[PDB]
Amino acid sequence: DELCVVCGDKATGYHYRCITCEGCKGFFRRTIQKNLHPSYSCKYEGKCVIDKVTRNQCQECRFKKCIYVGMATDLVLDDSKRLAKRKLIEENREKRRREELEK
Amino acid sequence: CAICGDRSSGKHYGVYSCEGCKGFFKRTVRKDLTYTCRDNKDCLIDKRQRNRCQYCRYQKCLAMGM
DNA sequence: CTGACCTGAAATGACCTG
DNA sequence: CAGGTCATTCAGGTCAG
Ligand SMILES: [Zn+2]
Ligand SMILES: [Zn+2]
Ligand SMILES: [Zn+2]
Ligand SMILES: [Zn+2]
Q1: Is A40 left (phi over 0), alpha (psi -120 to 50) or beta?
Q2: Feature table: binding site of A for Zn(2+)
Q3: Which residue from A41, A84, B25, B49 has the least number of CB within 10 angstroms?
Q4: What is the rounded distance in angstroms from the CA atom of residue B29 to the CA atom of residue B17?
Q5: From the CA of A45, how many Å to the C1' of D6?
Q6: Fold of B1-66
């Protein structure tokens, strides 16, 4: 763990099974969550360079690179699992009623 | 540890093992589900790589006796 | 839209109990 | 060394720039 396997920037640990930076992590998550890939279209031949500086220049090449290295699209929670998580966190915040139950 | 590379906290269940593979196996069979390797049960279980694959680590547990 | 930074569940693995 | 703790160590959401 140290450098992002997709663009070479500093990484923040494992994300979707790969050592990546917050940049590639966020991009991947949002592409899967909103199914944005189909609209991604390289404007040349899919050979664009993806490095810590050029990563935002071609969305399709950046996503095809995330797939190639092995980022797990299945670790991006579907709507039922995402909503269940928010539900859990919100209702857990019921520590409030207990705080006031102490005294 | 007969599983990873880490030292053994003595014997547990089916063999001498670390508290990592100990806790891991302690939890596994209790709240049990079914791990599934993302690869091909090749995942080398060692100190620095043990948490990467729960399939291989679990099979590795019962494999070496546990 | 991006990504540096955040919140908190959940898993791991240290360290005690008898 | 079966037994429990339970402080510590990767998801989705946020919003300025
Ligand atoms: Zn990156
Ligand atoms: Zn391109
Ligand atoms: Zn071990
Ligand atoms: Zn495996």
Answers
A1: beta
A2: 4, 7, 21, 24, 42, 48, 58, 61
A3: A41
A4: 16
A5: 54
A6: Erythroid Transcription Factor GATA-1; Chain A (3.30.50)
Experimental technique of record: X-ray
CATH architecture of A1-103: 2-Layer Sandwich (3.30)
Residue A8 structure tokens: 């070479």
Report d(CA A73, CA A71) in Å as an integer.
6
Is-contact B29 B14, C-beta < 8 A? no
What letters, b where the CB count within 10 A reaches 16 and e where it falls short, cover A72-82? eeeebeeeeee
* Contact between A21 and A5 (Cβ < 8 Å): no
> In whole angstroms, what is the distance from residue B6 CA to residue A94 CA?
40
